[PDB]
Amino acid sequence: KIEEVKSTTKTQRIASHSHVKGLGLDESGLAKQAASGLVGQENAREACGVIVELIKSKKMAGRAVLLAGPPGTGKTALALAIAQELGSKVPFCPMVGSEVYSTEIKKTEVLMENFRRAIDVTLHDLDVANARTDKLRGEINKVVNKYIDQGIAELVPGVLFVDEVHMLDIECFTYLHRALESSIAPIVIFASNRGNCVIRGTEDITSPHGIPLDLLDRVMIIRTMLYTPQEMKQIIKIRAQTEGINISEEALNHLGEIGTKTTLRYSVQLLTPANLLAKINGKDSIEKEHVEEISELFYDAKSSAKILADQQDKYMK
């Protein structure tokens, strides 16, 4: 009855991918070096150019995509640019794998309210006005089915991104697999950065990517590679000019050699507290004196445990 429930979206999740406009492809099907926001990664960007064809030509019945690569090589950006290729604000609901371990709400409702967040109006957008629950969705599904049989509202399939997939237990993989065999279901792109792992809940079954073998043979795997130190700076250069942060050339190359020791999500995270430190000294941009100062105040997670473990032996005798 109410159809202006305009925005109810987790903006802070996809705030870091504001510059991703498209996949950046040619009409023949080839990838360019730098186009529509993305830079490099020519193999996985061409592979997503086939997935957007099998989605449109009605050939993705039952299949899914697993983006398997190291952490910090843009698995979220290639799964966000795959949503702008469908065209005109197709939804996108990212979630981590450890989100379903909530105590106050059951596991079967967290993964269900994420499926109704991906299917302009989303299906979970209509489910927050009518609250002011399983018994409510019987009549809300009815009226949108009433609208399409009338012939007004068109139904679109979204993109549903599950990162950190090895923490999903066996009782939730079966709930996904019962939904992949529907007709209106979205594409259920996974992400994993691990090899052979133990399925959570069986304690003896070693499986590829933490995924059961029932779902694994309905899965197309795309590999994302690491970044060169040349193409690493072009990622930080786009993120510096999208946020309004001027940066010197001699200081950008020092921020691009930090990302060859840590992940790339540590270098882009240092754009804000180095720029606000450069507002204290009364400058507009950041220099090598500022980036070298932040790198001695803030530590990455892997090199912060190495500080404590190398003092753990000397503190306890």
Partner: protein, 296 residues
């Protein structure tokens, strides 16, 4: 799904396979051994026993029991559920397997908690009338080594009924730990059920047998393929799997169509091979990466 070309096991009256019949190509022994069970069902002697089809995945383990329904009477039900399909959140292990036995009899279409108790009371004397008779099912279970002994003891209960269907199980694992206890047992099955069932073993495909299936499934998804493309596609069929070599059929029917060739050449199969990986290379790559990161 991908078992739509099978219309039987392909046997004569003397029970010798002719190696190319009714969609089945290859599987010399297990198609003959499933003809003995087809006589043991018709003679009414399979009661108290079941069939287990051991072998690798990718080896006809679904299509053999699928062909065993159409080599029976002309309209016979068939339920192919997986092993970990019962481990759901909407239903427990006594709800899912109850709907499996109610499906392959269909009675589950007549059902769709005590609705199971009224129809059996309804069909109690409706069966003695004779207007619509009953038929047995060819109920399948894939990957049975993921079940536990709270469900294995249900299978001994449900097989006692006179309207029960012939159970057909499947696995690909050796001496495993039983789910729920602390003993090793063959095939993940407790020893009360291993001593009462027929075990059939399937051997993996050859070079010639894999090519005839890839030739059939191209004609089911109407793609014109080149001859040199076939001899490099079955070479992926022997090293990796068969469910991945069947996956480059559609995904290379778009690369040739995008460049307007209307015939899948050898270059396209050697292009989609470098885009979409498989589980043998992807698991190898992150293992090769996480070891190098572990060193320094």
């Amino acid at each position: 799904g991908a078992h739509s070309h099978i219309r039987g096991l392909g046997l004569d009256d003397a029970l010798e396979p002719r190696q190319a019949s009714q969609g089945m190509v290859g599987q010399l022994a297990a198609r003959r051994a499933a003809g003995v069970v087809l006589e043991m069902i018709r003679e009414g002697k399979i009661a108290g026993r079941a069939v287990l089809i051991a072998g690798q995945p990718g080896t006809g383990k679904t299509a053999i029991a699928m062909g065993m329904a159409q080599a029976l009477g002309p309209d016979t039900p068939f339920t192919a559920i997986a092993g970990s399909e019962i481990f759901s959140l909407e239903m427990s292990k006594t709800e899912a397997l109850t709907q499996a036995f109610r499906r392959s009899i269909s009675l589950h279409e007549i059902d769709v908690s005590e609705v199971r108790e009224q129809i059996n009371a309804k069909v109690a004397e409706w069966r003695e009338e004779g207007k619509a008779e009953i038929i047995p099912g060819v109920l399948f279970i894939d990957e049975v080594h993921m079940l536990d002994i709270e469900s294995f003891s249900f299978l001994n209960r449900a097989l006692e009924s006179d309207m029960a269907p012939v159970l057909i199980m499947a696995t690909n694992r050796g001496i495993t730990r039983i789910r729920g206890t602390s003993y090793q047992s063959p095939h993940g099955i407790p020893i009360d059920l291993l001593d009462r069932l027929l075990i059939v073993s399937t051997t993996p495909y050859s070079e010639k047998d894999t090519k005839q299936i890839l030739r059939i499934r191209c004609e089911e998804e109407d793609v014109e393929m080149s001859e040199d493309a076939y001899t490099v596609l079955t070479r992926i069929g022997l090293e990796t799997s068969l469910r991945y070599a069947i996956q480059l059929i559609t995904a290379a029917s778009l690369v040739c169509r995008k460049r307007k060739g209307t015939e899948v050449q050898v270059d396209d199969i050697k292009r989609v091979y470098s885009l979409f990986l498989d589980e043998s290379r992807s698991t190898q790559y992150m293992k090769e990466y996480q070891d190098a990161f572990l060193f320094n």
